[PDB]
Amino acid sequence: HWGYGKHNGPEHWHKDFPIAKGERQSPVDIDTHTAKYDPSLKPLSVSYDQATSLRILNNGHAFNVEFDDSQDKAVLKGGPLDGTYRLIQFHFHWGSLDGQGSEHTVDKKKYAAELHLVHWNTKYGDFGKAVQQPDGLALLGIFLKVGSAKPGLQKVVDVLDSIKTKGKSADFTNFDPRGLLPESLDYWTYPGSLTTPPLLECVTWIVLKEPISVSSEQVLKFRKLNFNGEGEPEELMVDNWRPAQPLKNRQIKASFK
Ligand SMILES: [Zn+2]
After folding, report:
1. CA 71–ligand 1 middle distance (angstroms)
2. What domains are there in the chain, each with its CATH number?
């Protein structure tokens, strides 16, 4: 099956998932000089005050912090979006070294990591139905650079030892994802896709311009995770990022002047 190893990585995905060579694939490089300010874009509305985290799972390609999305609690609205999108999970992509790890790039710059908060459009009733629609998901992307620690990330990093290997999960209640947001909600937006198989073209991307800072110790702990299952030969979970894809017939819009 697909992965990020030497023989099943992103350059191989198209064989099982032909949409990998599609017209609206993600991630992409954000060329800051070509992205146009769009005065018609509204402020993002991130309402996470009532977010209910439940569990954290190592799924063999990342770790997902999962939320209770059976009610309208943690929602993303406004910005380029029409309607309401419910938070279902967040996860990260990171590198083996600080000089790579992010999926989106900014003027070809790679960040050390990238956070994805995944939300589905409530007009489609459930996540499974939403991913079959061009406006089914809204993904909020946030870059991580290495510097000062992010206090709000530490509860995530400290639980990672308990989910080292594929298929392991742990209770993870009462985690507040507001602690992962940067100061500014300025963003770029474009239509794209899931960045892991099945690579469905169902995502409105909202990528924040301001990165958050995390410490070297924090990201080092990400890199102690395993792609493999318990008892199997150790493959460190690093470089679980898909590289930039062709922009094709798309425009990236900026929310800021
Ligand atoms: Zn992702």
Report:
1. 23
2. 1-257 (3.10.200.10)
Q: How far is the CA of 101 from the centre of ligand 1 (A)?
A: 11
Q: What is the DSSP string of the chain?
A: ---SSTTTSGGGGGGT-GGGGSSS-S--EE-TTTSEE-TTPPPEEEE-TT--EEEEEE-SSSEEEEE--SSS-SEEEETT--S-EEEEEEEEEE-SSTT---SSEETTBPPSEEEEEEEEEGGGSSHHHHTTSTTSEEEEEEEEEESS--GGGHHHHHHGGGG-STT-EEE--S--GGGG--S---EEEEEE--SSTT--S-EEEEEESSPEEE-HHHHHHHTT-BSSPTTSPP-B-----PPP----S---EES--
Ligand 1: distance of its center to the CA of 242 in Å?
A: 9
Amino acid at 190: Y
Q: Which positions are annotated as active-site residues? A: 61
